[PDB]
Design an enzyme around this catalytic site. Structure first.
Site, mmCIF file in Angstrom:
data_model
loop_
_atom_site.group_PDB
_atom_site.id
_atom_site.type_symbol
_atom_site.label_atom_id
_atom_site.label_comp_id
_atom_site.label_asym_id
_atom_site.label_seq_id
_atom_site.Cartn_x
_atom_site.Cartn_y
_atom_site.Cartn_z
ATOM 1 N N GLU A 1 -7.709 5.306 6.490
ATOM 2 C CA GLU A 1 -7.434 6.641 6.327
ATOM 3 C C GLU A 1 -8.760 7.363 5.379
ATOM 4 O O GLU A 1 -8.838 8.550 5.531
ATOM 5 C CB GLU A 1 -6.425 7.346 5.795
ATOM 6 C CG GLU A 1 -4.867 6.520 6.447
ATOM 7 C CD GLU A 1 -3.642 6.088 5.929
ATOM 8 O OE1 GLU A 1 -3.509 5.885 4.666
ATOM 9 O OE2 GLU A 1 -2.655 6.085 6.849
ATOM 10 N N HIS B 1 -10.045 1.309 3.506
ATOM 11 C CA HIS B 1 -9.118 1.859 4.290
ATOM 12 C C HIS B 1 -9.386 2.816 5.297
ATOM 13 O O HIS B 1 -9.999 3.871 5.314
ATOM 14 C CB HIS B 1 -7.972 2.315 3.589
ATOM 15 C CG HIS B 1 -6.558 2.360 4.106
ATOM 16 N ND1 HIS B 1 -6.244 3.074 5.159
ATOM 17 C CD2 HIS B 1 -5.483 1.468 4.256
ATOM 18 C CE1 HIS B 1 -5.015 2.962 5.590
ATOM 19 N NE2 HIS B 1 -4.871 1.664 5.147
ATOM 20 N N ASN C 1 0.671 -1.066 0.123
ATOM 21 C CA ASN C 1 -0.026 0.088 -0.050
ATOM 22 C C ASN C 1 0.903 1.271 0.021
ATOM 23 O O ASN C 1 1.223 1.863 1.003
ATOM 24 C CB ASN C 1 -1.008 -0.029 1.124
ATOM 25 C CG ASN C 1 -1.893 1.207 1.106
ATOM 26 O OD1 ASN C 1 -1.952 1.928 0.232
ATOM 27 N ND2 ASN C 1 -2.810 1.398 2.408
ATOM 28 N N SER D 1 2.566 -1.426 11.022
ATOM 29 C CA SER D 1 3.860 -1.542 11.473
ATOM 30 C C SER D 1 4.524 -2.775 11.396
ATOM 31 O O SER D 1 5.646 -3.000 11.992
ATOM 32 C CB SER D 1 4.056 -0.860 12.808
ATOM 33 O OG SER D 1 3.496 0.304 12.664
ATOM 34 N N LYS E 1 0.101 4.247 -0.693
ATOM 35 C CA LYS E 1 -0.819 5.157 -0.345
ATOM 36 C C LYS E 1 -0.531 6.369 -1.271
ATOM 37 O O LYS E 1 -0.083 6.165 -2.283
ATOM 38 C CB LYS E 1 -0.297 5.584 1.020
ATOM 39 C CG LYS E 1 -0.567 4.360 2.062
ATOM 40 C CD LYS E 1 -0.891 4.975 3.621
ATOM 41 C CE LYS E 1 -1.006 3.500 4.484
ATOM 42 N NZ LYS E 1 -1.100 3.813 5.805
ATOM 43 N N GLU F 1 -6.519 -4.191 10.252
ATOM 44 C CA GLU F 1 -5.355 -3.285 10.676
ATOM 45 C C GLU F 1 -5.973 -2.746 11.597
ATOM 46 O O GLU F 1 -6.649 -1.580 11.494
ATOM 47 C CB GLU F 1 -5.451 -2.456 9.400
ATOM 48 C CG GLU F 1 -4.982 -3.149 8.025
ATOM 49 C CD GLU F 1 -4.677 -2.120 7.154
ATOM 50 O OE1 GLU F 1 -5.048 -1.238 6.648
ATOM 51 O OE2 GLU F 1 -3.202 -2.223 6.719
ATOM 52 N N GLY G 1 1.390 2.906 11.108
ATOM 53 C CA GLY G 1 2.511 3.791 11.000
ATOM 54 C C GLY G 1 2.951 4.538 12.306
ATOM 55 O O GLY G 1 3.427 5.702 12.284
HETATM 56 O O1 LIG Z 1 -2.125 1.078 6.711
HETATM 57 C C1 LIG Z 1 -1.538 0.301 6.008
HETATM 58 O O2 LIG Z 1 -2.044 -0.174 4.984
HETATM 59 C C2 LIG Z 1 -0.356 -0.209 6.518
HETATM 60 C C3 LIG Z 1 0.045 0.904 7.577
HETATM 61 P P1 LIG Z 1 2.039 0.869 8.116
HETATM 62 O O3 LIG Z 1 2.709 2.057 7.093
HETATM 63 O O4 LIG Z 1 2.159 1.004 9.301
HETATM 64 O O5 LIG Z 1 2.359 -0.685 7.354
#
Ligand SMILES: O=C(O)CCP(=O)(O)O
Lengths: 249, 249
Positions: free
Chosen positions: B96, B94, B10, B212, B12, B166, B172
């Site tokens: 976010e 997701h 991902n 993480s 992002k 997640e 993160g």
């Molecule tokens: O949110 C995700 O898809 C992964 C989060 P990380 O950056 O901690 O792996």
């Protein structure tokens, strides 16, 4: 005497490789003899194809949105990303986004500021609803929109800005908007700019009509003193966009 | 025994052309000796560059979001547009998007449903926040989320669904959930699945961990009975993604 016109094509969330390729082709063929800025605003996914395939000297590409910084915003696309990619144009704060995606004025204002700061040419959108219009609140709203954006800009930053006034009240509502109604609004934005930012800024500023435009009405709309071009939706996925460009002289 | 693991990247809202080429060259360089399905979710803007350059047979390219149908959604990308572009995998719901862009369980469920109708492979994100975990409410939260998705899906659909667990508080931050925390969470999802859907389905389903994950922690996380792989944010922008991949063995 008007600034350089702009014929912007907002393809919105539409298109296929095939159908778009064709349209791109119709465009590069177009003989445009006057000073106009043609802008094709595609989906993020179609940027590359559009980039390669558009060759016309008067055409430049735009993205339909963006966020300011990179980072953990899954599904979003940032200004740095776009800038690296070779996109210098952007539509910010469209009606559909303010409605469906939570774009407050301040969010828009922030985005415009970020873009302006990164070197983009920004087509920033403003415009009021049927509700807002009906209740005698047109000027209050439009001026608030422009003012919010204005705050974060320095005078010298205005060279990077284009305003598209969208008559939200006339889109999907049943209502009709006459060229005198476009002009009423257009002139009120310029008024504002002239007054708060400066006459010199005012004169140069592009105020695009962002409502229902087609091959039949675009000449007429264009006739109006403060109409400097168009932000086209529907008619942009079509061959008549070429009449839209012609109508800008 | 276990279902075929997934190791997804991902990216992002991150990346440069050159930067991504580099990872992709590395990725293409890697000899993946075991049966793992590798996924790369890049921005919309780079799906082209990713699709054209990413050669490795064990890798697919996926989108970070989409909306169900095409239309007047300036800034947005639809499933039909993605399908047209040769993208057959999608990451939906997701954390976010739920947080920042108001994606409700309803919205996610509807997106997923449409995505599976249109024949995508769907990585569906579910997970509780810090506040909820500290409040004792994790169980409720994750089930409500999974059950929302479930409503819109008939039996066979499950074949195209992947569930990513997640925990928000691990996204993160550095606070990787322990293997014990992840395994109890992953087991819960599966026990709900077997119960409501079918035992046949529950044994087939992939449930991924995200938050993480790095090259270090990955092997232990993976050793848990109900951990079928990872959704990797950060470490996916690095060559350590490779380590995470080898960890699904
Ligand atoms: O949110 C995700 O898809 C992964 C989060 P990380 O950056 O901690 O792996």
């Amino acid at each position: 005497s008007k600034p350089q016109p702009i014929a912007a094509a907002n393809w919105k969330c539409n298109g296929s490789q095939q159908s778009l390729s064709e349209l791109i082709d119709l465009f590069n063929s177009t003989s445009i003899n006057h000073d106009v800025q043609c802008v094709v605003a595609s989906t993020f996914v179609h940027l590359a194809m559009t980039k390669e395939r558009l060759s016309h000297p008067k055409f430049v590409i735009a993205a339909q949105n963006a966020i300011a910084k990179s980072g953990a915003f899954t599904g979003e696309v940032s200004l740095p990303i776009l800038k690296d990619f070779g996109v210098n144009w952007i539509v910010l704060g469209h009606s559909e986004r303010r409605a469906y995606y939570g774009e407050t004025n301040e969010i828009v204002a922030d985005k415009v500021a970020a873009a302006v700061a990164s070197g983009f040419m920004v087509i920033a959108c403003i415009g009021e609803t049927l509700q807002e219009r009906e209740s005698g609140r047109t000027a209050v709203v439009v001026l608030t929109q422009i003012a919010a954006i204005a705050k974060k800009l320095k005078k010298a930053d205005w060279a990077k800005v284009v305003i598209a006034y969208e008559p939200v009240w006339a889109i999907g509502t049943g209502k009709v908007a006459t060229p005198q109604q476009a002009q009423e609004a257009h002139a009120l934005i310029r008024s504002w700019v002239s007054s708060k930012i400066g006459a010199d800024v005012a004169g140069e500023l592009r105020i695009l009509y962002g409502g229902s435009v087609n091959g039949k009405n675009a000449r007429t709309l264009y006739q109006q003193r403060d109409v400097n071009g168009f932000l086209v939706g529907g008619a942009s996925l079509k061959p008549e966009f070429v009449d839209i460009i012609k109508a800008t002289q």
